[PDB]
Design an enzyme around this catalytic site. Structure first.
Site, short mmCIF file in Angstrom:
data_model
loop_
_atom_site.label_atom_id
_atom_site.label_comp_id
_atom_site.label_asym_id
_atom_site.label_seq_id
_atom_site.Cartn_x
_atom_site.Cartn_y
_atom_site.Cartn_z
N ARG A 1 -15.92 -53.13 -18.55
CA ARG A 1 -16.29 -54.43 -19.07
C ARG A 1 -17.79 -54.62 -18.93
O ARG A 1 -18.55 -54.20 -19.81
CB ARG A 1 -15.56 -55.52 -18.30
CG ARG A 1 -14.15 -55.13 -17.90
CD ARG A 1 -13.32 -56.29 -17.31
NE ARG A 1 -11.98 -55.83 -17.01
CZ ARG A 1 -11.04 -56.57 -16.43
NH1 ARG A 1 -11.32 -57.82 -16.11
NH2 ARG A 1 -9.84 -56.04 -16.19
N1 LIG Z 1 -9.38 -61.12 -26.69
C1 LIG Z 1 -9.84 -59.75 -26.68
N2 LIG Z 1 -10.27 -59.10 -27.83
C2 LIG Z 1 -10.65 -57.74 -27.75
N3 LIG Z 1 -10.61 -57.05 -26.55
C3 LIG Z 1 -10.18 -57.72 -25.37
C4 LIG Z 1 -9.80 -59.05 -25.46
N4 LIG Z 1 -9.41 -59.50 -24.19
C5 LIG Z 1 -9.55 -58.45 -23.33
N5 LIG Z 1 -10.04 -57.34 -24.03
C6 LIG Z 1 -10.36 -56.03 -23.41
O1 LIG Z 1 -9.55 -55.88 -22.24
C7 LIG Z 1 -10.24 -56.41 -21.07
C8 LIG Z 1 -9.58 -57.55 -20.32
O2 LIG Z 1 -10.11 -58.82 -20.57
P1 LIG Z 1 -9.63 -60.01 -19.55
O3 LIG Z 1 -9.67 -61.42 -20.39
O4 LIG Z 1 -10.56 -60.04 -18.43
O5 LIG Z 1 -8.09 -59.75 -19.00
P2 LIG Z 1 -7.50 -60.68 -17.77
O6 LIG Z 1 -6.40 -61.71 -18.35
O7 LIG Z 1 -8.54 -61.52 -17.14
N6 LIG Z 1 -6.81 -59.73 -16.54
P3 LIG Z 1 -7.67 -60.05 -15.10
O8 LIG Z 1 -9.04 -60.92 -15.47
O9 LIG Z 1 -8.05 -58.77 -14.50
O10 LIG Z 1 -6.80 -60.98 -14.02
C9 LIG Z 1 -11.67 -56.69 -21.54
O11 LIG Z 1 -12.69 -56.61 -20.59
C10 LIG Z 1 -11.77 -55.97 -22.91
O12 LIG Z 1 -12.41 -54.73 -22.95
#
Ligand SMILES: Nc1ncnc2c1ncn2[C@@H]1O[C@H](COP(=O)(O)OP(=O)(O)NP(=O)(O)O)[C@@H](O)[C@H]1O
Ligand SMILES: Nc1ncnc2c1ncn2[C@@H]1O[C@@H](COP(=O)(O)OP(=O)(O)NP(=O)(O)O)[C@H](O)[C@H]1O
Ligand SMILES: Nc1ncnc2c1ncn2[C@@H]1O[C@H](COP(=O)(O)OP(=O)(O)NP(=O)(O)O)[C@@H](O)[C@H]1O
Ligand SMILES: [Mg+2]
Ligand SMILES: [Mg+2]
Ligand SMILES: [Mg+2]
Lengths: 54, 480, 466, 310, 128, 255
Positions: free
Chosen positions: B351
């Site tokens: 990320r």
């Molecule tokens: N809406 C999106 N569109 C495209 N790629 C995405 C998207 N959301 C997440 N990704 C990819 O997958 C990752 C996860 O995003 P994230 O919103 O942080 O998941 P999360 O729900 O927060 N799980 P966590 O934060 O670890 O408890 C990113 O850093 C991207 O590389």
């Protein structure tokens, strides 16, 4: 022609179908074991728990 | 006679010694035993004090003397530890004298708040083509290395450590990176070889190895990654840069579970304690990037997690995934096939570190991430059969041997070779032959071009056309 | 008065008062450290001893050590002199910008809005996110839940919402970071200063920040969810205002509970959780609400452990929402972002009388073809596409497009998608699908609908390929 | 000095001592019985009481029975006089061939080689068997998992291994039967005699045998591997040999643990095993290695519960 | 007895699963630490004490023999459950019987693929 | 609240058609006055829009003359959020049904013993209407959340935990409550108490301690199933798996 290109054709679709089948099998056998271990524990945790509570 | 700065042991059982005495002793204060063994006040109850033992609790007999030390649990930190192998208490186990440590840190520090920080900007270079191009890490970031047993998890850390030679033997001080390898639960045999190997690459000199191996008491393994984390904060906190590797957190969690269960705490998912997420979140927050207000130093963290049958949605893998800023997923299949490093490029992610990628790479890199993209499903007409050809080749390019980190430009070079498609008419078996020749060639002769791509930090219009000629003639020179 | 630590373990400490004894909920104050160490009474064990949950590290405490009753709950700054400031779980400020001089205070605990105060005002809140709008729309002043396992994109989605929503929004917004990434805070702060929702220069700031992240003790994570709660509460009541409450991650609240319930001395419940998971939650949860007075539109990201949507934590929480968006690893792994499960995300306002039975009709029409595709999912996996009847060969192709046209490149991950961040208005959402559904497009390649804005960019894409 | 039995539940005995207290891991020897009933110290309980697991059945102990601390953990004979012999978990010869006449004894518990003692080199211990040496070569001081049950050559693959590593290197071997079936144990005895590797005449015997059979109690099965380990250690450490340690079979070693651990009533970990699982295994598996002085290389048969490699 | 007087006995333990259950009960009410399926840590030790008592005494001891056919009831064919696991582990063969076999016509319903005897050929007359 | 249920004699076979006005239910799984018919299903399947559509049906009879066809409604709301209880009353009110309808409400924020007790209280209130010759329909929504509450009390009271942590009598809990609905015999009023308990399943798992208990108790049930729902079959019912243990004995000879 048609029934050489059909025999050969399904000899192949079958080969495939069964490879797919065989993967499902492995992938499924896999969750089976996960579920398996899980259950063993969940039951042991319920015993231990109610046994501590005496 | 003394009952306030002192105790004798009531019972020494399931790895908790209940002591009597130690009135003044505080929560989390390292006490000390007759043996020489150290321990940790953890339980402050009315009549007794619960001590976690940091060693073999056979030595702990009933009614043994136990002195305070007024020290909250802490390890030796500082430049003096580099080059040394030490247990999780800091003692040296490498037989090379003692360590003239001068400073000390609580193993149990809190992590820098919202303020003392700032966005990861500077590169942490594994020197591994695949990582550095498609999953760029950046100093101060946490990247999870997670895969099945024997898929190359450790190799990755080891190479990354070996790579930092080229910066530490360098003239530039903001590029230097100090290395901290924590062995949690591994064979002692393995740490030892690991250490020798590091020593042959002349990488041990900038490295601290902290070992709590398979035969060490659980709390030792439970402790180590934190001991090590402290050692590496010192570098972050005096405006330097460190990289810490936790190998592995899966085994630490296991150790912690032993302690939890033995102390009769309540089991949940997989019999882990409820606080096994905290156990990891609080160790891995202690790594980040300081704003210039605090010396803009950084701790980068590569924790390792061992999945079972590729299950990256167990309890412990999702915990750690939900902590770190992305992960490099290694796949037993790929490894088997021969794709090594066995990285699942589609599943692996970074990320934050996206923006800490060198520019030179970014050019050629971004256009690989893309063609490999259109390879993954299309995996027939001219162009789709092309998109394959191109793919199987770019793939071959990213296979890389152990113990050979590449200079970032050496990387951009051999990648350039494939993204402009000079590799296309070579049969793939031969691709790695070609690569090794081509690279060792430009390296020997064209130190010019390499030196320049690093400098313009970019494939210059000249650089490019220069490079074009090199590769174009070299691949006529390729007889089979 | 005064009493003493007699037992300490983790974040649970036992104090003995000879004279007097603090009500359950009274913030105590440890006397002897360079650091405000609030305890919080939670039990009377008897023999004039109480049991308390710390609000910070307890290394150091000793059997002995004095404690002063504060005569009150944990109380924090509230009012407009919070907007722009980052404050921690006990009100202390942590943006290193002096103190938060404020008229009044509030306690973090508080009874919840009586039945008479409830409001049935249901008006749609458009996000410009195709899946959310078309299939399970958010409701103004509603409770919203974002369910996801580790890495499926909750945080990104909450961010996109904060952008497509709280940027052009006349009204106060509160953001409570509960036990997630400290670097995500640093990131928010800066991102909101540049964009200027927070302003260091003025009092023109439109947002308050409350943070207690995954590095702080159980107690702290346990509670901070409520600190930020209290803040939003004020802006609703003593201001009869439009409040936006964002939490990330509400799960960490129940989790932290679990970590302490062990040593508080409760007997473990299902899956090891605290006996009190439903109410511990429900009290806290039912304060987050829109009343007759003010109006809170809440958006809570909800982590799902080991992807187990039945884990008590996620499982219980569902009760509390008006619209839910559920994210599946399964989908995300097919590069379908945002990773929304179309057959598992729901809203209590997908109702023709509320959204107008063109909306309700294109929705349930997509929701149908999808769930028809999903049934074939098994035979297609074992025998292959060919064994599919002719009618069915279609139901797939169309569905597969829908599947793909719900993907939408967010204005955030312009970095992961590389693609330019689109935001699609309810009209062209409803339209485009209707067309896809009536099969105007059975002549276009699948990809053509993957990662686009309105249906034009779709048909448009289809050309650049040809 | 002398102590006393103060509780006997199952194969776990509690024992009071007046003056000194035997450390954890000490060998107490219950008094007044036809056959040596060793107890091994598990926990210090307080009130000068220790808890123990029994290395044999407990029927007929009375509370008050005199117990005598031996002042060490379990100790067993070692050296070449063990070759050809069959000793049980506590060193008694059980081949009815008299006593195992040696000067040296050794404590079955003991610590992994220190970090500074580990050799960092990896080289192949050669078996002279083509299949193995070519494709999946044993590493000096490594552990080898050996799969497939009966009638696949297992017993013979072992014998020929005992034989060659002896022949072409001069490395004796120890076989540790963890949960040996009394039947097969008898048979394995004779097969080794019949084949060569044991010799009841000369001393050209090449394999010491330690058996902890299926009808001994949890304590004994759980510690028998360590006895076998100990015997092999003498050959590495004092005689600088490249030794072979056979463990058959490691899964029963784990189970014996998991049992013993439920008897001391430690709360059980995931899926049933001891919470001690990892380190129980670690502190044995870590003694098996290449030290400067020599090397124990070990082949261990594995059962996979439920064909579940996970 | 017969074994040790040069004679030959066969003992059937029908049903060694139900004995386990009973022993479990005593162990639990005695308040002894529960383990998997709530059986004690000695429910292996229980059966292995017993079944290791069948043998074939060499000549010097009568020549006698005790032979044991223990009987385990499995649930839904789970032969990895705690007791099955244990006994299958202790014994040196299994004759598995199956319900589909039974109704297909195979009676006795012996699955000849899973069934096994580690003594094998050696226990057989040459004709056979 | 703590009243035991009518034994054997005070009763008579359930003969009285309790109409839901839902084609699906009234033809294939018909309820009758005195019956306990369970509504069970995954969340957001339509479990409530059953019980609501049914009270809203009782307008017709309660705004007329025939004094037998009249049905007063209680509606316990255990565990839900006030934001909903309300939005629901508003729904009743609008369609004009609120008039014949008690609505006892112990919600999320209410104490633990208060959810424990709520569906009992709401029962006593419906016991009156039957014990005094009139017709009641009480709807517990839902027993799942109630059980959870009872669990809390029980665990905090240090009563050693059983399956899924619940306490031993967690069956007795729903058994006893649910027996208190009966069809009183003439010699006792002729009055009734039809009871629609509601259960919520996880991923469809009807092995879950609770959902299996409550099914063993009620005189049949309607299953819901999200699958059918999106498929178009609204109200999503699953005929083949829904049973009414009173059959036609509770329809008009017209149906
Ligand atoms: N809406 C999106 N569109 C495209 N790629 C995405 C998207 N959301 C997440 N990704 C990819 O997958 C990752 C996860 O995003 P994230 O919103 O942080 O998941 P999360 O729900 O927060 N799980 P966590 O934060 O670890 O408890 C990113 O850093 C991207 O590389
Ligand atoms: N880049 C590579 N190229 C070719 N072979 C490799 C490479 N990396 C690792 N290997 C091989 O794979 C190794 C497996 O161990 P390792 O590299 O430490 O990964 P691991 O997942 O950490 N295994 P473990 O430490 O047992 O959990 C071998 O010993 C190597 O010979
Ligand atoms: N017959 C129907 N036709 C179309 N939509 C319906 C129908 N019945 C219910 N719905 C819709 O489906 C949704 C769920 O109905 P509901 O009664 O709340 O099921 P539920 O399982 O009780 N939900 P919950 O209380 O969260 O468990 C609503 O918001 C309705 O508008
Ligand atoms: Mg490794
Ligand atoms: Mg997040
Ligand atoms: Mg409902």
């Amino acid at each position: 022609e048609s029934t050489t290109s059909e025999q050969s054709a399904r000899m192949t679709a079958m080969d495939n179908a069964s490879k797919n089948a065989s993967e499902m099998i492995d992938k499924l056998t896999l969750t089976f074991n996960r579920t398996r271990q899980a259950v063993i524990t969940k039951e042991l945790i319920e015993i231990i728990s109610g046994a501590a509570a005496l | 006679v003394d009952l306030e700065e002192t105790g004798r042991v009531l019972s020494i059982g399931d790895g908790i010694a209940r002591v009597h005495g130690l009135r003044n002793v505080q929560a989390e204060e390292m006490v000390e035993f007759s043996s020489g063994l150290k321990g940790m006040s953890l339980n402050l109850e009315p009549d007794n004090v619960g001590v976690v033992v940091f060693g073999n609790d056979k030595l702990i007999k009933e009614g043994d003397i136990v002195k305070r030390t007024g020290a909250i649990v802490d390890v030796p930190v500082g430049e003096e530890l580099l080059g040394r192998v030490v247990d999780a208490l800091g003692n040296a186990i490498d037989g090379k004298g003692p360590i003239g440590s001068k400073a000390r840190r609580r193993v149990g520090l809190k992590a820098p708040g919202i303020i003392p920080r700032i966005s990861v900007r500077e590169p942490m270079q594994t020197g591994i083509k695949a990582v550095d191009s498609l999953v760029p890490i950046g100093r101060g970031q946490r990247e999870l290395i997670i895969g099945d047993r024997q898929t190359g998890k450790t190799s990755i850390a080891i190479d990354t450590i070996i790579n930092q030679k080229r910066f530490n033997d360098g003239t530039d001080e903001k590029k230097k990176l100090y290395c901290i390898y924590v062995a949690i639960g591994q064979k002692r045999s393995t740490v030892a070889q690991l250490v020798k190997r590091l020593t042959d690459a002349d990488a041990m000199k900038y490295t601290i190895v902290v070992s709590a191996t398979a035969s060490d008491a659980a709390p030792l393994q439970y402790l180590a990654p934190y001991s090590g984390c402290s050692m590496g904060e010192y570098f972050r906190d005096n405006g330097k840069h460190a990289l810490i590797i936790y190998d592995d957190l899966s085994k630490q969690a296991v150790a912690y579970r032993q302690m939890s269960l033995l102390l009769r705490r309540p089991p949940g998912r997989e019999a882990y304690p409820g606080d096994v997420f905290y156990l990891h979140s609080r160790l891995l927050e202690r790594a980040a990037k300081m704003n210039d207000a605090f010396g803009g130093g950084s701790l980068t963290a590569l924790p390792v997690i061992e999945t079972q049958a590729g299950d990256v949605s167990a309890y412990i893998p999702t915990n750690v995934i939900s902590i770190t800023d992305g992960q490099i997923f290694l796949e037993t299949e790929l490894f088997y096939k021969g794709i090594r490093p066995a990285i699942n490029v589609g599943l692996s992610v970074s990320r934050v570190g996206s923006a800490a990628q060198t520019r030179a790479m970014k050019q050629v890199a971004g256009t690989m991430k893309l063609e490999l993209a259109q390879y993954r499903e299309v995996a027939l007409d001219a162009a789709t059969q092309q998109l394959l050809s191109r793919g199987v080749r770019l793939t071959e390019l990213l296979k890389q041997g152990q113990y050979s980190p590449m200079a970032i430009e050496e990387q951009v070079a051999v990648i350039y070779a494939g993204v402009r498609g000079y590799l296309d008419k070579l049969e793939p078996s031969k691709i790695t032959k070609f690569e090794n020749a081509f690279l060792s060639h430009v390296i020997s002769q064209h130190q010019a071009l390499l030196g320049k791509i690093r400098t313009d930090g970019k494939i210059s219009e000249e650089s490019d056309a220069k490079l074009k000629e090199i590769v174009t003639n070299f691949l006529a020179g390729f007889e089979a | 008065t005064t009493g003493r630590i007699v037992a300490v373990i983790g974040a649970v400490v036992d104090v003995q008062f000879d004279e007097g004894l603090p009500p359950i909920l009274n913030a105590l104050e440890v006397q002897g450290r360079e650091t405000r160490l609030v305890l919080e009474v939670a039990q009377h064990l008897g023999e004039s001893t109480v049991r308390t949950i710390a609000m910070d590290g307890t290394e150091g405490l000793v059997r002995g050590q004095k404690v002063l009753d504060s005569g009150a709950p944990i109380r924090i700054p509230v009012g407009p002199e919070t907007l722009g400031r980052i404050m921690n779980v006990i009100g202390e400020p942590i943006d290193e910008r002096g103190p938060i001089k404020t008229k009044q205070f509030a306690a973090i605990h508080a009874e919840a809005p009586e039945f008479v105060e409830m409001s049935v005002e249901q008006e749609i809140l458009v996000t410009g996110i195709k899946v959310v709008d078309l299939l399970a729309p958010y409701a103004k002043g509603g409770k919203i839940g974002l369910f996801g396992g580790a890495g499926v994109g909750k945080t990104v989605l909450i961010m996109e919402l904060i952008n497509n929503v709280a940027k052009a929004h006349g009204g106060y917004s509160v953001f409570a970071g509960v036990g997630e990434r400290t670097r995500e805070g640093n990131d928010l702060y800066h991102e909101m200063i540049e964009s200027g929702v927070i302003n260091l220069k003025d009092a023109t700031s439109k947002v308050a920040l409350v943070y207690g992240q995954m590095n702080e003790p159980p107690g702290a994570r346990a509670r901070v969810a409520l600190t930020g709660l209290t803040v939003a509460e004020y802006f609703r009541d003593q201001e009869g205002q439009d409040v936006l409450l964002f939490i990330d991650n509400i799960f960490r609240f129940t989790q932290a509970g679990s970590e302490v319930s062990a040593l508080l001395g409760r007997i473990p419940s299902a899956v090891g959780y605290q006996p009190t998971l439903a109410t511990d939650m429900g009290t806290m949860q039912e304060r987050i609400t829109t009343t007759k007075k003010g109006s809170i539109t809440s958006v809570q990201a909800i982590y799902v452990p080991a992807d187990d949507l039945t884990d008590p934590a996620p499982a219980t929480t569902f009760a509390h929402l008006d619209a839910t968006t559920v994210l599946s690893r399964a989908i995300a792994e097919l590069g379908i972002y945002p990773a929304v499960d179309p057959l598992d995300s729901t809203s209590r306002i997908m109702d023709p009388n509320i959204v107008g039975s063109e909306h309700y009709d294109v929705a349930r029409g997509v929701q149908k073809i999808l769930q028809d595709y999903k049934s074939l999912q098994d035979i297609i996996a074992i025998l292959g596409m060919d064994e599919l009847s002719e009618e069915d060969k279609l139901t797939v192709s169309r569905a597969r497009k829908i599947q793909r046209f719900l993907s939408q490149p967010f204005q955030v991950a312009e970095v992961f998608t590389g693609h330019l961040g689109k935001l699609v208005p309810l009209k062209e959402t409803i339209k485009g699908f209707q067309q896809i559904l009536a099969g105007e497009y059975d002549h276009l390649p699948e990809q053509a609908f993957y990662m686009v804005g309105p249906i034009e960019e779709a048909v448009a894409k289809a050309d650049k390929l040809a």
